[PDB]
Design a protein around this ligand. Structure first.
Ligand SMILES: Nc1ncnc2c1ncn2[C@@H]1O[C@H](COP(=O)(O)OP(=O)(O)OP(=O)(O)O)[C@@H](O)[C@H]1O
Ligand SMILES: Nc1ncnc2c1ncn2[C@@H]1O[C@H](COP(=O)(O)OP(=O)(O)OP(=O)(O)O)[C@@H](O)[C@H]1O
Lengths: 278, 49, 159, 47, 195, 41, 304
């Protein structure tokens, strides 16, 4: 007897309690990557007729990478919260299991569910857990992972270019990625997540500080000029522990006298380069 | 003599109220039904049996 | 702003103009008011004429738009109200009342034309809705227009 | 290679393709025992 | 401030409108009061405390380390007040590798998956991660990230008054005639451990 | 190599103004942006 | 309160009112300081901000065990604010809510006239299905015979029919100008501007009642006839039908050339054949079987 398709890896996403409720206004001043991710998955999943009538072969899959904590997860959170069609995700390590050959089932059933369900979007992260460079086909432990790579790479190609399934790829270290995995036909679009420096820095400041007190005079543009390449994630940490400092002194409004010691608490990278060498 | 009912699995999806799909903790999945007093609505996808 | 103005001549799309005026708002926000107010009146202006009944009042309700509640905002909101209510006499009265602040646009031809006849045709579809057959003098009295112009407009509206 | 009706082959030295050549295939010359099975063939690889 | 106050008094945080910190880590010279805190903090509730050596997790099987830490986090979500603890995380930490050996594959896999399990598509609520290692010079910046691990706490070699108080604590079970200048031992002590 | 990138990105420009036909200014805008990318590094 | 309050003092209050709401709820002081600025912002003649910050005190209930002197005495500003616009059903439900404390404080002087007011301007709201649910709710309570004219108010309840406005005016001039309590008449018709707004509202009510009764029991009808039943001119009649058909409340085709209109819908042959089919099946199957089996019961009852 034949059966309707089924996957257990990522059931679906019940989506009523699974929405991350992250707004596009929540992410701070990253108009660029939001623009080409709307161009990448949002518009083609709906206006597929436009892409066929212009004939610019819309991308099967787009990979995102970069330094850690540049917002690579919250972009996925926001597009999953704001999508109209179906979406699915799985942590990118569950394709290894206790027994033999479960992983090929774990990828084939989720691809089959993506095909069956809707014009959906599948999210895969940490490809370095599943995509390495070399292999030792004598451990047995490795044999499963070049296998599961084998099957994912094959079941990429089982699309008719008409199904509106979009895969979004996340990783931290792009060095381990095999070039044929990013070969055109599989991942024809790649985007890096650069560390914001000045243009976005006051923007992410403003977005994270819109929910704070900042009573009358707490300056921010004196902090945007400070060098040494502050990342994106740690601004959240700065505001968070500044609030911790404010609540330790039993004060319900954060003052400007908190932020300088708050800033010197976190970064702490002093010089690491002797000045005569400069 | 009748406490041999020993093997443990996990349910996958509801086919009908009497047709179910389960996965053994050893290997292959299976098609399995239930007795008529097990609260078949309570057997959500995601529980051990 | 220049792109939104220039491509609002062939009358193809104003959503492009709407996006241009939006990014003009967050450009000019809190730094350049004399471009901000005229960009706001342009954005509401281009939005209303493509049949956005309540979107004028909804979009002006935002705080960034609440802070700019000048005479242009009342002009556009009463224009939108008359549009969604089809009160052409009220539309002309509001046009006369705000004509000092409605002649400020260097583009005038888009508005004294191309919206007047549109409003007239929704007046026709709002007055035909009660009856099935009528005499022409009754509807001419109901809308307070002439005969021959209404006769030819009814000819096109039957064509 | 397509115009000449020759079996286009290229190798990147990856280990995914390694299992398609031999069990360990420690050298590279092993490729020939299958390459000569498609005698109209051409060898290519990148930088 | 992070391990006790939000668990009992979370209201001030939403009064100020920010999430309490997700976890912290400890570092310093070896034997310099970490697990005293950890076996001292462990003597507070004894019901919300799970504590592992970062070495029993690995196993010769295929991927069961990921399975066991998955159900570990599931157990943490089962009882909403829970405090997890991993000490000497270097055994799982490392920096990264470009596949020298083959064991690096699944141990790094376990690492990556632990990262996505601690901040991926989930509100890890009322669960705090306090860490401990001898040397943080061999840790992944992905694990070191302020979004990932919020506050770093250094423990230095004990100061002279700190050494004084420590030896006074270790002067509990002593029998002798008391004519001792503790200051002499304190002054002769320099760079000495907490143990 | 960049020629196909320019033509694809010109079609992308064509798709962001919602038009069924690409215009001659789309190509020059695309090659201008690719030239700016060439200015980077 | 030192400066006796003005626009500026209330604007000064308006910012810090929510601070203790993020601090702590106490069910007696915090609600008082949540409602004092309600009163102040009403005095500023601002309503939008007033109602937004009013959306915090609405959930502040179940406290009525000791908040009797405080609970509904701050409910007068909500009805004032909703009286500023047209929100008739909202304030009717508000008075239905604001009845428990005067019921505890029953003397029929600050007790009965509240009921008189709410049942008086339940009519003032437009026709509506849960409005009919509310008129079912408020009818039947054992105090409504205390109002003597409530039996006359029962006219606009069911068996609608003709509502000749001259008869209503002749019956209600005294209840609008005189009475033992007379207070809702002052609240509704006694004022000049509010009185005239209620007057034209009641005219709108009675004319749409006649529209509804003609919608229920008419196929075709003439303008002279429906005008003389409406006790109003033909032009204003056609205006009312025109502005009530754009609301799609009542389907009609009001044709103004010969003089006759219809109220019915153009009849789909699918619809008519369907109606004949379903009435055929039901009313010659089930009642037929029922009659047969009660005939069996009848012969069972008497001699076999
Ligand atoms: N625009 C932004 N830039 C940086 N951080 C942001 C931004 N918006 C929100 N954040 C928050 O700042 C921290 C940095 O991002 P986060 O920790 O989510 O890393 P990530 O890149 O999303 O994840 P990963 O790097 O593991 O893929 C997080 O708390 C994140 O939610
Ligand atoms: N600040 C201190 N006060 C008192 N005793 C201390 C202190 N620091 C260390 N010790 C002593 O050090 C010994 C080891 O303690 P513990 O097992 O907690 O080590 P740790 O500081 O966590 O470091 P490590 O795990 O690297 O040994 C104990 O006997 C304890 O009394």
């Amino acid at each position: 007897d034949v059966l309707p398709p089924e996957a257990d890896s990522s059931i679906m996403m019940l989506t009523s309690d699974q929405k991350p409720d992250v707004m596009y206004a929540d992410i701070g001043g990253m108009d660029i990557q939001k623009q080409e991710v709307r161009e990448a998955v949002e518009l083609p999943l709906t206006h597929f007729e436009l892409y066929k009538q212009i004939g610019i072969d819309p991308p099967r899959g787009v990979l995102m990478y970069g330094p850690p904590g540049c917002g690579k997860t919250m972009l996925a959170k926001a597009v999953a919260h704001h999508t109209t069609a179906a979406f699915i995700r799985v942590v990118g390590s569950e394709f290894v299991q206790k027994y033999l050959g479960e992983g090929p089932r774990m990828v084939r059933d989720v691809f089959r569910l993506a095909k069956e369900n809707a014009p959906a979007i599948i999210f895969i992260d940490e490809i370095d857990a599943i995509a390495t460079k070399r292999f030792d086909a004598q451990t047995g432990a490795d044999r499963e992972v070049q296998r599961i790579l084998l099957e994912l790479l094959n079941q990429m190609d089982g699309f008719d270019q008409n199904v509106n399934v979009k895969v979004i790829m996340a990783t931290n270290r792009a060095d381990t990625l095999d070039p044929a995995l990013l070969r055109p036909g599989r991942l024809d679009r790649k985007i890096e997540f650069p560390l914001p420096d000045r243009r976005q820095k006051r923007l992410i400041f403003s977005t994270i500080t819109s929910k704070m007190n900042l009573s009358e005079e707490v300056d921010l543009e004196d902090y945007v000029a400070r060098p040494d390449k502050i990342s994106g994630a740690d601004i959240n940490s700065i505001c968070q522990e500044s609030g911790m400092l404010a609540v330790r002194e039993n004060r319900y409004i954060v003052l400007a006298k908190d932020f300088e010691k708050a800033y010197k608490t976190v970064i702490k990278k002093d010089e690491q380069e002797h000045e005569f060498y400069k | 003599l009748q406490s041999v009912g020993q093997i443990v699995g996990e349910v996958l999806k509801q086919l009908t109220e009497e047709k179910f799909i389960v996965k053994a903790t050893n290997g292959p999945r299976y098609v399995v039904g239930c007795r008529r007093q097990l609260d078949k609505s309570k057997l959500k996808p995601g529980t051990r049996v | 702003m220049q792109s939104g103005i220039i491509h609002a001549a062939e009358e193809k799309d104003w959503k492009t103009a709407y996006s241009y005026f939006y990014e003009a708002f967050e450009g000019y926000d809190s730094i350049d008011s004399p471009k901000a107010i005229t960009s706001l009146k342009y954005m509401l202006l281009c939005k209303i004429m493509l049949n956005t009944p309540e979107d004028v009042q909804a979009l002006v309700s935002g705080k960034l738009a609440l802070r700019y509640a000048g005479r242009q905002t009342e002009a556009l909101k009463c224009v939108a109200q008359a549009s969604k209510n089809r009160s052409l006499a009220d539309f002309e009265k509001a046009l006369t009342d705000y004509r000092a602040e409605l002649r400020d646009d260097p583009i005038i031809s888009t508005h004294l034309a191309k919206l007047y006849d549109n409003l007239l045709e929704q007046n026709l579809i709002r007055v035909i809705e009660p009856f099935s057959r009528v005499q022409i003098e009754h509807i001419s009295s109901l809308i307070k227009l002439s005969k021959a112009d209404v006769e030819r407009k009814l000819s096109q509206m039957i064509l | 290679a397509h115009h000449t009706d020759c079996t286009f082959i290229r190798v990147s030295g990856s280990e995914l393709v390694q299992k398609f050549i031999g069990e360990g295939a420690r050298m590279v010359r092993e490729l020939f025992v299958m390459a000569r099975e498609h005698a109209p063939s051409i060898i290519f690889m990148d930088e | 401030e992070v391990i006790e106050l939000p668990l009992t008094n979370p209201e001030l945080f939403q009064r100020v409108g920010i999430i309490p910190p997700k976890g912290c880590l400890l570092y310093g010279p070896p034997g310099t009061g970490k697990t005293l805190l950890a076996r001292a903090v462990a003597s507070q509730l004894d019901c919300n405390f799970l504590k592992v050596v970062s070495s029993s997790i690995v196993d010769k099987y295929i991927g069961e380390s990921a399975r066991l830490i998955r159900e570990m986090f599931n157990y943490a979500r089962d009882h909403q007040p829970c405090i997890i603890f991993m000490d000497e995380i270097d055994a799982i930490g490392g920096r990264r590798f470009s596949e020298g050996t083959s064991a690096d594959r699944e141990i790094q896999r376990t690492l990556m998956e632990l990262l996505n399990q601690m901040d991926g598509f989930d509100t890890l609520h009322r669960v705090k991660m306090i860490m401990a290692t001898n040397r943080p010079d061999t840790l992944d910046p992905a694990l070191l990230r302020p979004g990932r691990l919020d506050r770093k706490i250094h423990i230095d070699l004990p100061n002279e008054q700190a050494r004084l108080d420590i030896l006074k604590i270790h002067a509990g079970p002593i029998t002798k005639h008391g004519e001792i200048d503790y200051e002499a031992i304190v002054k002769l002590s320099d760079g000495f451990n907490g143990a | 190599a960049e020629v196909k990138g320019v033509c694809t990105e010109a079609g992308m420009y064509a798709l962001r103004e919602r038009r069924v036909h690409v215009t001659q200014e789309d190509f020059e805008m695309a090659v201008a942006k690719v030239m700016q990318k060439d200015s980077e590094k | 309160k030192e400066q006796n309050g003005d626009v500026k003092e209330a604007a000064s209050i308006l910012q810090e009112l929510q601070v203790e709401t993020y601090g702590s709820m106490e069910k007696k002081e915090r609600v008082e300081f949540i409602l004092e600025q309600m009163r102040l912002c009403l005095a500023v003649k601002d309503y939008i901000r007033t109602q937004i910050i009013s959306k915090k005190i609405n959930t502040k209930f179940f406290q009525e065990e000791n908040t009797e002197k405080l609970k509904l005495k701050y409910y007068n500003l909500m009805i004032q604010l909703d009286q500023h616009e047209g929100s008739y059903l909202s304030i009717c439900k508000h008075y239905r809510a604001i009845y428990d404390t005067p019921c505890i404080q029953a003397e029929s002087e600050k007790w009965q006239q509240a009921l008189k007011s709410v049942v008086l301007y339940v009519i003032l709201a437009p026709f509506d299905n849960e409005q009919s649910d509310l008129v079912h709710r408020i009818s039947g309570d054992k105090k409504l015979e205390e109002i003597p004219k409530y039996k006359d108010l029962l006219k606009l309840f069911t068996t609608m029919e003709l509502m000749r406005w001259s008869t209503l005016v002749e019956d209600y001039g005294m209840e609008l100008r005189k009475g033992s309590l007379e207070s809702p008449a002052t609240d509704v018709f006694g004022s000049t501007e509010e009185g005239e707004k209620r007057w034209k509202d009641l005219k709108n009510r009675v004319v749409e009642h006649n529209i509804r009764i003609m919608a229920k029991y008419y196929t075709r009808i003439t303008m002279k006839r429906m005008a003389q039943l409406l006790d109003l001119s033909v032009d204003e009649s056609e205006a009312f039908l025109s502005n009530l058909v754009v609301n799609k409340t009542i389907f009609a085709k009001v044709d103004r050339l010969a003089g006759i209109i219809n109220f019915q819908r153009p009849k789909d042959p699918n619809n008519l054949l369907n109606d004949w089919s379903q009435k055929l099946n039901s009313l010659m199957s089930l009642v037929n079987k029922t009659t047969h089996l009660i005939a069996k019961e009848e012969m069972i009852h008497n001699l076999q």
